[PDB]
């Protein structure tokens, strides 16, 4: 039994322009097994309509997934991604820095 | 086009 | 040169139903098909428009193959739990990669059917499409059953025939999206880190396929040993993103350039942080 | 509370995809029948009782014969109160591997079933009996019955390889 911890990336589909529409994305990759809990956060509050890609994996057999949602960013609005996995003792929070 | 059926492992 | 790959994941969940079987299909970096044994009515669905116009007779056949594969992978998970003398209460994973690699000439470059158990290589069809390679002594049992069942013949014929043909057809019917260059849109951002330090981030956005290389170079030195490189992300619309960051001394950034090679370009790009003024 | 009869129609050895029927019946008039498979995949099926000519019968259709459907079956004849288990019925699936070859020494009418696929066991039948193969020098594996054949692997003694040449 091998276990890999996920790598997490919070980012928007396009560079954020205030008032313009965009997609919020959390990309989880390089993990094993495939059981993973990923939620998106507006004001640290969870988000309802969060879709995800179909479970696929890489040539080294590690899994990856894209969780995403529609949003329109604001100067004062904030967004994060929480990920829980057996490799983790407590879920990781990764905030959306529009410069990353 | 998916591969055809095979006996289990 | 192109590719078609099917990625399968079977996860056993002992006290909570049959193992979940998921299979997704790709032509190069473009998914076109999907199957999920947990959906309301499990059926192979299209995910790229160049397979939507295939007849219902096509999707019914693919769905039958998928259901049968779900059953056979349930059985395989059971057999491997037996082979390793493992408890009937643990969750275990069985993965498969199958499909065909097409050379620049369209002829079969490589046929694949490989399988991993709990993320570890288990058994793989060899490139001659006639033999197997088993990773341990439990996989030797699977090798003997596979041989006695003439599995390498059916697989060799699928790979040499149906796989390559239908990949050629997929490639023609989506010639534009699939065989298009599609280079990345670029720019360089500057971010103050602290007194005497600041970060230069080099962006490549909206490119297909996913293969790309960006490297930071101060004047001449290749700071990959110091470059922060994220793995390539899906932008969400079938295209990909990537960036590379270097921590530099404040007021010394003009020495730095970002060098970016990709398929959709000829001259490898070289761009620097340009403030607008 | 009297064990019933479990009979495989049209026989205990099924070919893949071929639906086969398990008949459980007794002159005891249970209104419920429970069929239990032990093996690779344990399972239990419920048919309601049928009454005809003084026998309660139950026709368990087990469908497109797969690997997960092989095993050892019993059936039990008031939903809670069940009978003594019937005599066990080993139901095997056939049609998974290459069929072996039957040589004999000397007469045609010390047998042998041969293939270079290293089966772990071999089997027989008429309209059973077993023996495990022993390899040799020319790259083949062999078992022979002192005095129709099948092959099988050690971990699954209910999944057999293909109906060999009749004799």
Author numbering:
A (entry chain B): 0 to 99
B (entry chain C): 1 to 9
C (entry chain A): 2 to 278
D (entry chain D): 5 to 81, 86 to 117, 125 to 142, 147 to 166, 176 to 195
Quote the authors verbatim:
The closely related inhibitory killer-cell immunoglobulin-like receptors (KIR), KIR2DL2 and KIR2DL3, regulate the activation of natural killer cells (NK) by interacting with the human leukocyte antigen-C1 (HLA-C1) group of molecules. Central to this process is the interaction between the killer cell immunoglobulin-like receptors (KIR) and their cognate ligands, human leukocyte antigen class I molecules (HLA-I). While the KIR2DL2/3 receptors share ~94% sequence identity and segregate as alleles of a single locus, they are inherited on different KIR haplotypes, which has implications for NK cell function. Here, we determined the crystal structures of KIR2DL2 and KIR2DL3 in complex with pHLA-C*07:02, which showed that KIR2DL2 and KIR2DL3 engage HLA-C1 with different docking angles.
Next, we next determined the crystal structure of KIR2DL3*001 in complex with HLA-C*07:02 bound to the RL9 peptide. The KIR2DL3 ternary complex was determined to 2.5 Å resolution. Overall, the binding of KIR2DL3 to HLA-C*07:02-RL9 largely recapitulated that observed for KIR2DL2-HLA-C*07:02-RL9 (and other KIR2D-HLA complexes). KIR2DL2 and KIR2DL3 adopted highly similar hinge angles of 77.7° and 77.1°, respectively. Specifically, the structural differences between KIR2DL2 and KIR2DL3 centred on the twist of the D1 and D2 domains that differed by 13.3° for the D1 and 10.4° for the D2 domains. The extracellular domains of KIR2DL2*001 and KIR2DL3*001 differ at positions 16, 35, 148 and 200. Here, Arg16KIR2DL2 reached across the D1-D2 interface adjacent the D2 C-C′ loop binding His146KIR2DL2, while Pro16KIR2DL3 made no direct interdomain interaction. For KIR2DL3, there was an additional contact between Asp72KIR2DL3 (E-F loop) and Arg75C*07:02. For KIR2DL3, unique contacts were formed between Phe181KIR2DL3 and Asp183KIR2DL3 and Arg145C*07:02 and Ile142C*07:02, respectively.
